[PDB]
Amino acid sequence: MYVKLISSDGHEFIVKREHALTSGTIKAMLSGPGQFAENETNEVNFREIPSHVLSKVCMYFTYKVRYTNSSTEIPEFPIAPEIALELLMAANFLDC
Amino acid sequence: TSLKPRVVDFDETWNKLLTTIKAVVMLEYVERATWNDRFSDIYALCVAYPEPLGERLYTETKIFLENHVRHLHKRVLESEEQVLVMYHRYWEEYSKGADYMDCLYRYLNTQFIKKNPLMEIGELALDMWRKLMVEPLQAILIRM
Amino acid sequence: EEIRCRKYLHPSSYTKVIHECQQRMVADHLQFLHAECHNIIRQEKKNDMANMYVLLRAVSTGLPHMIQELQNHIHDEGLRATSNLTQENMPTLFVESVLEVHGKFVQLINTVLNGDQHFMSALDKALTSVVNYREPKSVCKAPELLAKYCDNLLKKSAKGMTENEVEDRLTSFITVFKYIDDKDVFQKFYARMLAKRLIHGLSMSMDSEEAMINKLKQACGYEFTSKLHRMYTDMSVSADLNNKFNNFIKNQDTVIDLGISFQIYVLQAGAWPLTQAPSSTFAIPQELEKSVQMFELFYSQHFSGRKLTWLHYLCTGEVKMNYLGKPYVAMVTTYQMAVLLAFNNSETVSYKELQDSTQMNEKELTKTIKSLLDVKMINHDSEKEDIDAESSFSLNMNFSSKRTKFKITTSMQKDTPQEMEQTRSAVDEDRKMYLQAAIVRIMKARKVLRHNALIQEVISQSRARFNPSISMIKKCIEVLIDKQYIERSQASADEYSYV
Amino acid sequence: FEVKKWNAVALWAWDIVVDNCAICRNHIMDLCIECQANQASATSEECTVAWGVCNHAFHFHCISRWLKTRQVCPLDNREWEFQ
Amino acid sequence: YNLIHLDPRTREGFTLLHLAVNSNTPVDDFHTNDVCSFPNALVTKLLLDCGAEVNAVDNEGNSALHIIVQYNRPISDFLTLHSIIISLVEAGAHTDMTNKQNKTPLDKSTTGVSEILLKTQMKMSLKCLAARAVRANDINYQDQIPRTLEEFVGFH
Ligand SMILES: [Zn+2]
Ligand SMILES: [Zn+2]
Ligand SMILES: [Zn+2]
């Protein structure tokens, strides 16, 4: 219910469950034979997403779940030039 | 590694994936490390450089599933009067297996199948269950 | 009733009524229809067959019996039309019979039976069963027949085989080829006779051969036509390579007049099946050793990292027989270049005088000598015509050639029947190794399997090229047992555990 | 005697035996998939074998386009240097 | 299915879906205008059923969404309009797609009803934000992203 996102560098990125279930494939990883309904770790390992990209992905999770119902000129998500084109593959692999 | 499109030999990654896939349809045990690595395997297969092996992955998983429901059919049909309980056990395994494979084939279902008369993996496994388990046993199953 | 319920009822009752019109009229008498269904198909009454189809289609369990009966009828018709053929033009007649059966039943299904895909699948299964019809405890002959059909139609002959019909006959041939289900045998046989057709120039059209290669590629993926396409590309590139060697020799500082014309057909060793099984140390003559060493230097200078494996049992030549007062010109094979060189120095030679000039096994020597004794270039000095220890030989002074272009290698372009069984054994051991690798992969990957399930898993991956028999995969299992790759589980012999 | 002309046949194989370009999955001596189309523009000689330090072989077009954006040998993840 | 698979395109790039979701598609003076009117929810749903290219782009850069949001009768025929939008969203129409003038369908709404319908039919879609960042910063996205992501970036 507090899941842990681990990047390719070992950087743990512990984030809330409903925050991390916005991405479809994280929901898929936590589903199936990946549940372990014991509320102990809920660990998902990202062998490919770098830490500087998974951090932006988690910040996007929080930003989306905060501004999902505003529709009143939400602030722009700050994406650096270098994070883009690497945040894009992360947002594809982690759908939405 | 990274999420860039690399080149992956389909035989190696598909043999790595089939060990997990075969343990999911029949509800065996697979580790978090393996179950999470198979998502990266499917992503690499559906993105593989220079041409994506998404259609190859779908064809091979369809071939596997039709070669798996046939085995369950031969195992259930050989039961004379226990065909109802064997069919129920195999269906209780296979429905959850199909749901879990629909979960695991998320990238193939979204980025490839919906992007294109193809059938989603969760829909394919169930539709192939009726075509290879229920329809051949339609005259038999209802009879008792 | 459809018209009557149209002008008498609410829309919501349009279907239900006709459903009750069917279940009481066609479904309740299914046993009457199905018992007649068999007799409908065998005599091929299209008027009755269409109505039977459109009636049984409404009933839930009426169609599959008709599908099975049509499949059985097509299978029996195929056996009747294909099993009576006896040699003559058997490879062509088998393909023509299967094509005629397929063409008849495709238009029968399309025109009469709504073009239903279930009956199309029944037709496909029936043709798969009839094509692979093998005699009990025998070997299937369909891939050999189809490969011989391709070899017969694609060869260069003056029998009026025009070019403008082959490229559309082969599209029809692909239909019978798709039902082989033993495609490894056909691939190997077609590779062998493609090598024979391309080396000797027997191909009637290079573009037609390339059309064959592309048709097989479209039929069975790229990896089916890998070696075939490399064969074709090698034969197409060899002319340009000969042209390149034509000016490489003049580009040297010293003009080396070799005295012979060079037409090398350099080929990929990983594609062509040309394997030199014995040692057979060829004693290259003085007129060819300089050429072969200079060509080896050419590849050592131009095409780096390309080892040469010279085989001399596919190359020919012409040698000026000036000792017989020029009785025309003869085309001859390479292995007896040694045999005739010792005759240049001494008129009479023996095995002692020829062993030092050849230096290989006696099996090659005996056959290469008999290749000249029968055609009467070499006569036996003594009365002992059979092969003995001494076996004195002499050049036939009195005999003279009659044909202007005397060819002694006619025996060469004949696909002897004995090498067919050798290729069959090669295919058998190739698929044995393939199944060895398949079982090793599955067993290592899964770490637990049953005896009745492991065979199914092996078939699942081996369906792509051939049909593995249950008895022969059983023999394959004990081969892994011998190689300590697998053993029977202690609790039960059904289970297997990797070690 | 003397020979007016001699036909010859020889099989060649690489010292380092490798079968197909792992990028395009076509055989190395076959045309690459990029040059397998539009055969009119291609002269069937541009698809030269491109070896490397890692003892791997690819079509020149395949490895040239792979090195356009990346700098890593496809199969074995090391620095790619032409040999 | 066969018709769209042979790709029929009007001289202005208007595919079958664009004409099905457009109120500017002419209807002759016969009894057709009493029955067949455009845009049609049922016709759009039928086209989306038979494998129509939902994200098809005409010469002006517009798509089916860019055309349906410009509907001039957004209340009286609201349901039809509403249905069409969700149909497009149910068939993978990208709500962030920019035309040749770089106008998202919200910038081409010209209507409060269509604007809020499309706003309620979106998702936040970090893919869209990353693609917008890539497009705005002129980063060369050739061969460094998946094959589908190239046209995804080309959308924005
Ligand atoms: Zn290549
Ligand atoms: Zn090329
Ligand atoms: Zn390497």
Author numbering:
A (entry chain E): 17 to 112
B (entry chain C): 1 to 116, 135 to 162
C (entry chain A): 246 to 744
D (entry chain I): 22 to 104
E (entry chain D): 472 to 627
Can you list sentences taken from the study reporting this PDB entry?
We recently discovered that FEM1B, a substrate receptor of Cullin 2-RING ligase (CRL2), recognizes C-degrons containing a C-terminal proline. By solving several cryo-EM structures of CRL2FEM1B bound to different C-degrons, we elucidate the dimeric assembly of the complex. Furthermore, we reveal distinct dimerization states of unmodified and neddylated CRL2FEM1B to uncover the NEDD8-mediated activation mechanism of CRL2FEM1B. Our research also indicates that, FEM1B utilizes a bipartite mechanism to recognize both the C-terminal proline and an upstream aromatic residue within the substrate.
An excess of the CCDC89 C-degron peptide was added to obtain the cryo-EM sample of the CRL2FEM1B-CCDC89 complex. Following data acquisition and processing, our results indicate the presence of two distinct dimerization states for the particles. One state exhibits a symmetrical configuration, while the other adopts an asymmetrical conformation. The cryo-EM structures of the symmetric and asymmetric dimers of the CRL2FEM1B heteropentamer (FEM1B-EB-EC-CUL2-RBX1) were solved at resolutions of 3.39 Å and 3.37 Å, respectively. Hereafter, the symmetric dimer is referred to as dimers, and the asymmetric dimer is designated as dimera. In the dimers, the protomer-protomer interface is symmetric. Two head-to-tail juxtaposed CUL2-RBX1 dimers wrap around the FEM1B homodimer interface to stabilize the architecture. The overall architectures of the two CRL2FEM1B protomers in the dimers are almost identical, as evidenced by a root-mean-square deviation (RMSD) of 1.66 Å over 1600 main chain Cα atoms. Unexpectedly, in one CRL2FEM1B protomer (CRL2.p2), the WHB domain of CUL2.p2 (WHB.p2) does not directly contact RBX1.p2; instead, both CUL2.p2 and RBX1.p2 interact with the N-terminal region of CUL2 from the other protomer (CUL2.p1), thereby forming the CUL2.p2-CUL2.p1-RBX1.p1 interprotomer interaction. Val7, Tyr49, and Pro50 of CUL2.p1 makes hydrophobic interactions with Ile44, Arg86, and Trp87 of RBX1.p2; an additional cation-π interaction is found between RBX1.p2 Arg91 and CUL2.p1 Tyr49; and CUL2.p2 loosely associates with CUL2.p1 via electrostatic interactions.
